[PDB]
Ligand binder design. Structure first.
Ligand code: FMN
Ligand code: FMN
Ligand code: CL
Ligand code: CL
Ligand code: CL
Ligand code: ZN
Ligand code: ZN
Ligand code: ZN
Lengths: 265, 24, 396, 284, 283, 265, 284
């Protein structure tokens, strides 16, 4: 708000060829992931029986060869990342305080006068926007009836986005695999504003924006672990349906990734 | 395969496996 | 990469792929998988050669394993000139327990051939050429052990014959080396080639274990058959032993191809072993035997029983006065009875060619643990190391 | 729900063979032969009560009989409530579909009505997929259909039409799901057809044209019976993918996307289209 | 003009062996050695005038020389103008094509007759492409048609039939041009199943061989009107691609390609067809 | 090595259309960034005088409007991310110990028996590879003459990659802006293996891989701050030249982003 | 280095006007008029010593004179040592370039030699950009040039040739920089030209063709003088972008990329090509 930028200024520099070619590509990775499409679609091009041989492996620069410089584990001073949560359970109330703790620590400076964030960004352009989705009636709320907000990392404030009900957001965000997912308290949705990602650096800016998205959810992972939340980054959703449910304009902004948060019991 | 109703002559194994949303 | 998939009812095989690799200086590996119609066909080297080699390896193996139909049925003396028929009779008399009379009155299934030197048209026994058990089912009592020695595939007859000649030389050289332990020379194990992908392999092998490079070319023969050997004691290494072999007119060329052959065998077995694949996935008895030879004692046994004709380890890869001589003249002086099986198929406005060079005056196949013509124009029982005579060479 | 898959069951002398997409079986049981013949004459879906009765009549254990029929590829059992409860085909050539409602049941496709575009008072139920197929394209026809039915709860549309030498099937337009409409598609193709080597369609020449009332027809080749038959099969199969008996699963990244067919080469191209910048379908 | 086919000559001392796609011939005339040597390096095309010059120079009677070159498969004499005047469709479902001859005029496709495979006494004119379309496949039906018409001047064949979920269109088989036949594909495919290093006990070859043993056809699986309409159009467009074609204006890969269509996905797969050395079409 | 996966297994599932379309797109974002091209090329489509209005801003869901739910800074328990380093100075020796501390903490479990990493990954496929580039003769080394290694996060070991000299890597990685960059001690290079990113999830897998890259450099940022290193994520490099210098095969693997590390004095 | 930019300096009666790409000036100083006329007759680059002398001769302060000439767009001062110290053009039509070495100096382009492809013992220096332009394409010609010069320290290549109705300029092939070669380009275009609606070029039809010796010519339209003149300008401008007086800067993401021109419409398409999977340029 004190830090507001109008997208009218950004579009002044947009190359329309770049923008079209990037969107055309991006949409290739969108999913139609719905419970009703379960038996007539698939996700994995690898059969489930052969997946295990591909998971948690190392590809080598010199395959067949074992000559390596071993490094000691004694230099590791970190805690082990918690396993990603699955069949979340919302039996407990979750306070807005807990959700506020996540947001400010993941995405904002402790100094509210500062404009520097805990993740870097190409050109300091910060093209990725964070939306909060309230998914359980056992999740405490700020504004009654409002279940989508937009987190303003510099102002350190939530902007009201949508008054869609809790079951519609959950259905859109959880795609076809909602029974395995269970019932999370809330989600973060990380969204690219195409023209903000493209205006300065052109195609390379898209790459920078997607990478930035990963820096952001990673901070959320680490913060989540320290405050007692389980989480799971999640790609099993219908992109356009999530967008529509959140009242996003798909010509300007698209959901790159969802991240679920809650308890596991 | 083997049943009282007949003897299986042939199988399209790729299609049978499908009858080259995490991890496994 | 490539990744061409065919329907099971297609003429073409299930899959063709060029494998990704992180390292631009490692050879490219390409592979065709085709169920268990044949074992997977692969080649390694420069990118295009790897792709061409895999395609050609596939055509070759498919032809000899799955596709031969015999041309008729004749006794040996109807089939060819009398001194050729006599040489086959003496090969086959060592192979089975059957009598000379039984061998000469038996009507063998035939395939087309010509004499390597005179180009005279004839036939030879189909039982030596076809690797399935149906094509010459009735002849297998005479010749039960078959393999692909001397087989080749190419877009010209000349290239196919040359491919077959090279392999013939490789295999006849290997067996003679195997039986006697005699090599002509040893190339420095620290040899630098100047060729990026060859030196990359050599450097990785020398750090994982040790190598020995021997020129094992049939004595008096032109060209160079280079055998590369590898072994390690290193506990965490899956491959304890490997080998590569190649024959070319150029010594450098033979050495380079030999190195790449070793890498190809090394990696295919390594990947089989880290895949956790089972013994039931192995359908080829030469592959099964080679797998049981993956131990350090294969390496020490070869190296400690190798006798060099020259003690001076070669630090460089120049040719010599013998390299240059005529290979066909050299072979004819040993035997007139060298034949080229051939077949051909139109592809667009071209012909592709399948060939196998066969001689009953040389080893007819490379498994001396089986039924083999041990006494021939390059070897006789008792010349070499006795245990080797009944034991198959540790080579795939 | 039990779906009867494609198969034949043939006999000559004392020999009977079952052949499906999955397997072939030398059938040696008269009971199962009768069962298979009966399933072969039925169209698409069969009540499990009827299957059980058929099995009982031929004195065959129901679980063993069913297990055989499933594993061999004669039938399968689907559990999912689908998105559109029903399909309708609206067209300027309704005669072309005059046997489609009956025929396509064998492919598990439920089309309740073939509707002539000429009709006043065209009505459609909730959660219905509307397929609009036009030989004689006009954008006003599509606009009229959207105007009537966009607000129907759970509705979706597919549009099919001809452009140059191609048959075009748009991706699924679902307001609920936020997917691109017909106009988002036809603009993608009309700009790609301009011989100006640019993805970006926008110039002052295009801006001045957008001042006029948006309306248009499309150039295309004359259709013969073979082109129509080819089109008829593509429509059936596409509807089958979406709402009928699934024979081959589509990846989630292409399932709702457009399908274009060149009528000369018979080559298909499946492609997801973006929302056209100047379209307001996602504002509605 | 003259198409020069692929061949090889191998020479050793004064001996020369010629191998074509159908022959193996000892060449002991120096003249024919020089005729063959020259044609080897001529890249496929040669005019009547140049061949006659080459023959006259090598002291080889022009007629006996050309007859040898044609018979042994060194050359063929294909037309500049289209190879096939007309087409005929022979089928076990001829009623499917009851309007095809009229309809397809406007696509430039000329089909003179639709013929029931059940007819005794099928005649076909010279220089006519024979399209054999079968809903119920048996290899003797192809065998019969081939035996009846192989010797018709200028004849060619193409076959279409159903293999499980696929509709397959074979390449064009032309005795005159020496292109592969139906069996170059299917018998070779069966061979590969029969002679597999490890036989798949559930091979589709078991079905096809058992249908032979039991004297049954392989039915197309549950074809409806839409599958047939789809097939009808593929047939129309393939015929269109084969109309107007010669070796002058067209190219041998137009004949030596198969088209397979998955009837579920509607996806086409165009694949090369090659000769099988073991096939009887080569005798 | 105990966790080795051959890319031959991966390629068995590759859709060649997907792979070609993804590469064609990816290359659109590659740069030709060299000192010799400085005066005949540009990077920023926005004039430097107008950049400041785009940097460190907030785009709003409801532009023009100020109604927000403010969150308190008191919930922030984090340290401020350090400004990204620039004109790095390599006057001090930097130990391999410091570099080992970075690697194991950023990319590996403290448990060397574990196969779980401190960042998540779609399908647990981990398609992004980390390469170490030694850039100063004041940086201590493991194997004399070797300046590119490949970090094996599960084995917790360095695999030797290249014996190119220190000035060649520096030149390739620093592009046209090397004078402003100064002299870092080392770099990490994060690399996508295309077929590993694509084989299971198709186009969406590319998106997942680029996001994963950001989770990884973010862990490196945070670890770097705790162990006293300055760092800067860096996009100003010639992609193909970096690849060549590292002996990577551009048909299989490409550098997505470089990250520089060192001191600032 | 001082580069003289495009401008005119015109006079009639007592009025003199300077017109550049940047500005126009009513010139009221005889000294600067003379200076401007002198710069106008020179070709491309001028030694700062000569500029200073020219200014002194017309009694003009050197800093004020230089400041004027720079800000108005008459000259500029560049500081950068460029990547290729020199260019050569190798061609089957060397006559087409017979005035190019002299003319293109005014655009700041240094081409040391025009070389006929027919010549034996073609030699090239270190850090030289080799432009290979062929009207009569054969892949053996390109292979020969690579075989001779790939190992030259600091070398790079551009290839230009005709395909159908297009003039093609490959991206810059630089072994040092790892960029795609000619064969990576021509395979991209030959596959795009196949009317099989697929980006992926690979099928068994292509695999069997790769068994034969890689060699080929390309179909294209007959060239007239206008096509050649158009091609000549595109070559000049491309060389100018890379090695000459930069007039318009290229973005770093397209600078080394290919440029294709349709000779009918005269539309240009700049596109980065990937390494072709079956090419071994990056293995060398
Ligand atoms: C970009 C991204 C997308 C993901 N999408 C999903 C998903 O759709 N469903 C799911 O169950 N897990 C998803 N995951 C979680 C991974 O499956 C998980 O990180 C991996 O299996 C390792 O398990 P861990 O996180 O518990 O160590 C995703 C992770 C990432 C980084
Ligand atoms: C993907 C990415 C690429 C970057 N590339 C560059 C670069 O090429 N040059 C540079 O000076 N800074 C680069 N940065 C650093 C940003 O300019 C920096 O994060 C931003 O200006 C904010 O400053 P801070 O990191 O010091 O808070 C990059 C950051 C990211 C996330
Ligand atoms: Cl050689
Ligand atoms: Cl109405
Ligand atoms: Cl030369
Ligand atoms: Zn729209
Ligand atoms: Zn045949
Ligand atoms: Zn290349």
């Amino acid at each position: 708000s004190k830090h507001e930028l109008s997208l009218v200024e950004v579009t002044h520099y947009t190359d329309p060829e770049v923008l079209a070619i990037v969107k055309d590509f991006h949409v290739r990775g969108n999913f139609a992931s719905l419970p009703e499409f379960a038996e007539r679609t698939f996700v994995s091009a690898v059969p489930l029986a052969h997946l295990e041989k591909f998971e948690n492996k190392e590809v080598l620069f010199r395959p067949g060869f074992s000559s390596v410089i071993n490094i000691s584990s004694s230099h590791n001073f970190s805690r082990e990342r918690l396993p990603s949560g699955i069949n979340f359970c919302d039996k407990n109330k979750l306070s807005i305080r807990t959700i506020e703790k996540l947001l400010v620590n993941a995405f904002s400076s402790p100094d509210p006068g500062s404009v520097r964030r805990p993740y870097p960004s190409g050109g300091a352009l910060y093209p990725i926007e964070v939306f909060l989705c309230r998914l359980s009636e056992n999740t405490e709320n700020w504004q009654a009836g409002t279940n989508v907000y937009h987190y303003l990392p510099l102002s350190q404030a939530l902007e009201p986005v949508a008054t869609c009900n809790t079951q519609s957001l959950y259905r859109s965000l959880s795609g076809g695999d909602s029974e395995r997912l269970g019932k999370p308290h809330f989600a973060l949705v990380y969204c690219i504003i195409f023209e903000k990602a493209l205006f300065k650096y052109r195609y390379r800016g898209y790459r920078m924006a997607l990478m930035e998205t990963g820096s952001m959810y990673q901070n959320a992972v680490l913060v989540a672990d320290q405050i007692g939340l389980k989480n799971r980054v999640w790609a099993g959703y219908t992109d356009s349906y999530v967008a529509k449910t959140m009242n996003l304009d798909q010509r300007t902004v698209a959901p790159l990734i969802v991240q679920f948060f809650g308890d596991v019991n | 395969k083997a049943s009282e109703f007949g003897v299986v002559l042939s199988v399209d194994a790729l299609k049978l496996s499908r009858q080259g949303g995490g991890s496994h | 990469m490539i990744n061409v998939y065919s329907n099971l009812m297609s003429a073409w095989p299930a899959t063709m792929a060029m494998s990704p690799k992180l390292n631009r200086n490692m050879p490219t590996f390409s592979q065709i998988w085709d169920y268990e119609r044949i074992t997977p066909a692969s080649a390694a080297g420069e990118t295009l050669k790897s792709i061409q080699g895999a395609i050609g390896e596939y055509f070759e193996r498919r032809h000899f394993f799955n596709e031969i139909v015999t041309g008729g049925q004749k006794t040996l003396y109807e089939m060819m000139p009398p001194s050729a028929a006599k040489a086959f009779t003496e090969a086959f008399f060592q192979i089975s327990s059957l009598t000379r009379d039984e061998i000469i009155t038996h009507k063998f299934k035939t395939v087309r051939a010509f004499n390597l030197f005179s180009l005279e048209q004839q036939e030879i026994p189909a039982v030596i050429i076809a690797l399935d058990n149906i094509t010459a089912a009735d002849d297998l009592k005479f010749y039960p052990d078959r393999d692909t020695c001397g087989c080749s595939f190419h877009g010209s007859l000349n290239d196919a014959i040359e491919g077959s000649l090279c392999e013939f030389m490789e295999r006849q050289s290997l067996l003679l080396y195997w039986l006697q332990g005699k090599a002509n020379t040893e190339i420095s194990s620290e040899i630098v080639t100047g060729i990026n992908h060859i030196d990359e392999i050599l450097l990785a092998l020398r750090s994982e274990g040790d190598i020995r490079i021997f020129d094992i070319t049939l004595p008096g023969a032109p060209g160079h058959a280079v055998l590369t050997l590898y072994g390690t004691k290193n506990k965490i290494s899956r491959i304890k032993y490997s080998t590569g072999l190649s024959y070319a007119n150029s010594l450098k060329k033979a050495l380079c191809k030999s190195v790449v052959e070793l890498w190809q065998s090394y990696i295919c077995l390594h990947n089989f072993l880290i895949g956790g694949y089972t013994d039931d996935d192995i359908i080829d008895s030469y592959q099964r035997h080679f797998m049981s030879c993956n131990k350090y004692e294969s390496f020490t046994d070869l190296c400690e029983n190798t006798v060099l004709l020259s003690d001076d380890v070669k630090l460089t890869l120049e040719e010599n006065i013998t390299s240059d001589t005529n290979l066909l003249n050299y072979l004819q002086q040993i035997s007139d009875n060298i034949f080229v099986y051939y077949a051909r198929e139109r592809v667009s406005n071209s012909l592709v060619w399948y060939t196998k060079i066969v001689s009953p005056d040389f080893f007819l196949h490379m498994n001396n643990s089986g039924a083999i013509n041990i006494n021939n124009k390059i070897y006789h029982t008792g010349d070499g190391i006795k245990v080797r005579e009944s034991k198959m060479v540790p080579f795939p | 729900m039990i779906n009867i898959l494609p198969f034949e069951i043939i006999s000559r002398n004392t020999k009977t063979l079952l052949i499906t997409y999955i397997s072939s079986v030398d059938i040696t049981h008269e009971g199962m032969k009768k069962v298979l013949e009966s399933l072969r004459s039925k169209q698409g879906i069969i009540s499990e009560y009827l299957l059980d009765k058929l099995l009982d009549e031929s004195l065959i254990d129901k679980d063993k009989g069913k297990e055989f029929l499933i594993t061999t590829g004669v039938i399968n059992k689907t559990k999912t409530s689908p998105l559109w409860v029903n399909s309708v085909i609206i067209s300027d050539v309704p005669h072309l579909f005059s046997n489609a409602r009956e025929q396509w049941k064998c492919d598990g496709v439920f089309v309740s009505h073939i509707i002539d575009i000429k009709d006043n008072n065209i009505n459609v139920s909730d959660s219905t997929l509307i397929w609009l197929h036009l030989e004689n394209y006009h954008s006003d026809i599509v606009k009229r259909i959207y105007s009537k039915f966009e607000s129907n709860p759970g509705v979706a549309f597919i549009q099919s039409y001809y452009l140059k030498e191609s048959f075009r099937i748009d991706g699924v337009y679902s307001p609920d799901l936020g997917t691109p409409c017909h106009f988002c598609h036809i603009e993608r193709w009309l700009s790609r057809e301009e011989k100006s080597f640019r993805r970006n369609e926008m110039s002052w020449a295009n801006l001045l044209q957008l001042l006029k009332k948006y309306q248009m027809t499309l150039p295309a080749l004359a259709l013969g019976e073979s082109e129509r038959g080819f089109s008829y099969h593509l429509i059936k199969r596409r509807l089958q993918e979406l709402t009928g008996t699934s024979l081959v699963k589509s990846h989630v990244d292409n399932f709702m996307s457009s399908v274009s067919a060149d009528l000369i080469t018979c080559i298909l191209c499946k492609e997801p289209v973006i929302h056209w910048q100047a379209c307001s379908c996602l504002e509605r």
